[PDB]
Amino acid sequence: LEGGALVLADNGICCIDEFDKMDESDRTAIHEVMEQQTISISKAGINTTLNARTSILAAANPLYGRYNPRLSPLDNINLPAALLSRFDILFLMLDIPSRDDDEKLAEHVTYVHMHNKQPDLDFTPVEPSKMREYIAYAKTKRPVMSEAVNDYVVQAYIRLRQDSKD
Amino acid sequence: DDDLVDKTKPGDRVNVVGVFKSLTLILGNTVYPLQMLTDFDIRNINKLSKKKDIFDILSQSLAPSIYGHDHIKKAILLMLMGGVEKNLENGSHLRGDINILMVGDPSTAKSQLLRFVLNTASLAIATTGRGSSGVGLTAAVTTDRETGERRLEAGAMVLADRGVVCIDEFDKMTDVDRVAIHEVMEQQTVTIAKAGIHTTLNARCSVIAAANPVFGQYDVNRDPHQNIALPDSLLSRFDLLFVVTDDINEIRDRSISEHVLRVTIPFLRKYVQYAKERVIPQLTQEAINVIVKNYTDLRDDNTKKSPITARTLETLIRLATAHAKVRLSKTVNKVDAKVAANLLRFALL
Numbered sequence: 001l002e003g004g005a006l007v008l009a010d011n012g013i014c015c016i017d018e019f020d021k022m023d024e025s026d027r028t029a030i031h032e033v034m035e036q037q038t039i040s041i042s043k044a045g046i047n048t049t050l051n052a053r054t055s056i057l058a059a060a061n062p063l064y065g066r067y068n069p070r071l072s073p074l075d076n077i078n079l080p081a082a083l084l085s086r087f088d089i090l091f092l093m094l095d096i097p098s099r100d101d102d103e104k105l106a107e108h109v110t111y112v113h114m115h116n117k118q119p120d121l122d123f124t125p126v127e128p129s130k131m132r133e134y135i136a137y138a139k140t141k142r143p144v145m146s147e148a149v150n151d152y153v154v155q156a157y158i159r160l161r162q163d164s165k166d
Numbered sequence: 167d168d169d170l171v172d173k174t175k176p177g178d179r180v181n182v183v184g185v186f187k188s189l190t191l192i193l194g195n196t197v198y199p200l201q202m203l204t205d206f207d208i209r210n211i212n213k214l215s216k217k218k219d220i221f222d223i224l225s226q227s228l229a230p231s232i233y234g235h236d237h238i239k240k241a242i243l244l245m246l247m248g249g250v251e252k253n254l255e256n257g258s259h260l261r262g263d264i265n266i267l268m269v270g271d272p273s274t275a276k277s278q279l280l281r282f283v284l285n286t287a288s289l290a291i292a293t294t295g296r297g298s299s300g301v302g303l304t305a306a307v308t309t310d311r312e313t314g315e316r317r318l319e320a321g322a323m324v325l326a327d328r329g330v331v332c333i334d335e336f337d338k339m340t341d342v343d344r345v346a347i348h349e350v351m352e353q354q355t356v357t358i359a360k361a362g363i364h365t366t367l368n369a370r371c372s373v374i375a376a377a378n379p380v381f382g383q384y385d386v387n388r389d390p391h392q393n394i395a396l397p398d399s400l401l402s403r404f405d406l407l408f409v410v411t412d413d414i415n416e417i418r419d420r421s422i423s424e425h426v427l428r429v430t431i432p433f434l435r436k437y438v439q440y441a442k443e444r445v446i447p448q449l450t451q452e453a454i455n456v457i458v459k460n461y462t463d464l465r466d467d468n469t470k471k472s473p474i475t476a477r478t479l480e481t482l483i484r485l486a487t488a489h490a491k492v493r494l495s496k497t498v499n500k501v502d503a504k505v506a507a508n509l510l511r512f513a514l515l
Binding site: 003018103112126 | 345361462
């Protein structure tokens with residue numbers, strides 16, 4: 001086995017830059033590990049299944065580069081319904097020009113380009129080893145949901161389905 | 167031998183010291199992985215450090231065979247000297263390299279400027295943009311019967327790690343290398359995952375792209391977006407887009423014939439490398455506010471002629487730093503942001 005990139009990164013983050021610049025052959029294999037984490041290939045060489053876990057991170061842009069407020073988001077996004085229906089969290093990181101909020105981004109990039117140090121807030125940025133250890137320690141936990149949170153979950157799901165159900 | 171087995175890797179400049187034994191090979195005992203400066207040249211560059219007329223004559227002295235285009239070679243001077251390469255603490259690095267794309271009619275010296283920038287830089291790699299035997303510039307796969315296995319070939323961008331690379335005929339370059347430089351721009355690096363390997367490479371490689379339109383000719387009355395024949399992400403990747411017009415005008419075209427019918431080369435190389443090795447510039451409050459004012463005033467162009475991106479904020483101080491290190495001052499000044507805004511007004515309008 002010589003997997004493209006989904007096989008050397010078994011248990012971890014698999015990221016995709018320029019998601020709309022790919023083709024149908026890439027999308028049909030990305031959707032298969034997105035739904036079920038077990039690629040299966042049946043060609044003249046082998047008929048076998050490779051199982052890997054990959055928290056697909058995707059970065060995409062619309063059809064005309066930026067957004068369009070006169071266009072619907074189903075028409076602004078070229079991806080089909082089965083692709084983003086499987087996507088639970090989609091982040092519309094849209095930039096809006098402003099007078100007050102743009103100055104903080106400008107001050108922050110001039111502060112990090114002036115020197116490598118971060119801004120003087122009353123907080124220190126944690127190094128990679130400590131939160132890597134925290135993620136490895138938190139991953140062994142197995143939480144169990146209660147009944148009082150169950151009655152809130154089913155009511156919010158019923159209300160969200162009725163609100164979403166143009 | 168056993169001792170020095172962990173100090174060799176492909177893609178790096180090396181100097182070996184051995185014995186040419188012929189049982190033909192060399193028994194390498196000493197390996198060193200890697201213009202001379204005198205004390206007379208440092209007096210000349212220290213004498214030329216405080217005059218405020220240095221930049222224009224240094225930009226005019228690079229190519230005397232090409233008439234006009236002063237601000238384009240001003241940006242090319244700021245381009246070949248470099249940036250700062252800031253590495254953040256416990257996070258990702260910051261891009262110090264600048265990238266320039268040049269478009270226009272094919273009548274001028276865009277193909278004659280690459281030979282000058284290839285022969286006058288510290289180290290430069292030029293490619294045609296079409297004709298790479300591998301998958302592009304960065305690498306290629308090969309089979310060897312010696313080991314009976316598959317090895318990796320490094321075609322280009324991985325060789326030059328701090329210098330500059332030049333690609334002419336940018337529109338003829340396919341999408342595979344475009345996806346690779348999409349990673350190249352923001353990355354100031356690259357990444358590859360292939361059958362049996364996954365990795366990321368980080369060699370500095372400022373790009374100089376030269377393109378031609380798909381219509382063959384271009385004038386002011388045509389729209390400036392569809393004439394480029396490139397996506398908007400590539401316009402956002404490249405920092406400075408220089409448009410050179412060549413409409414026939416009887417007033418300006420009278421002296422080109424007598425000019426082509428009619429400071430030096432070893433000095434600017436020593437100037438650029440001494441600025442690259444010794445002085446690192448830092449920011450001041452006098453140059454933060456004027457660049458904040460310029461970025462907020464342009465974020466005008468969005469309604470009139472050209473899109474504005476987050477990256478452009480970074481490229482608007484990179485150039486300032488550049489000018490501040492052209493004068494080799496220990497910190498930046500307000501005039502560096504002013505000449506960066508002047509370069510922006512020439513390359514945008």
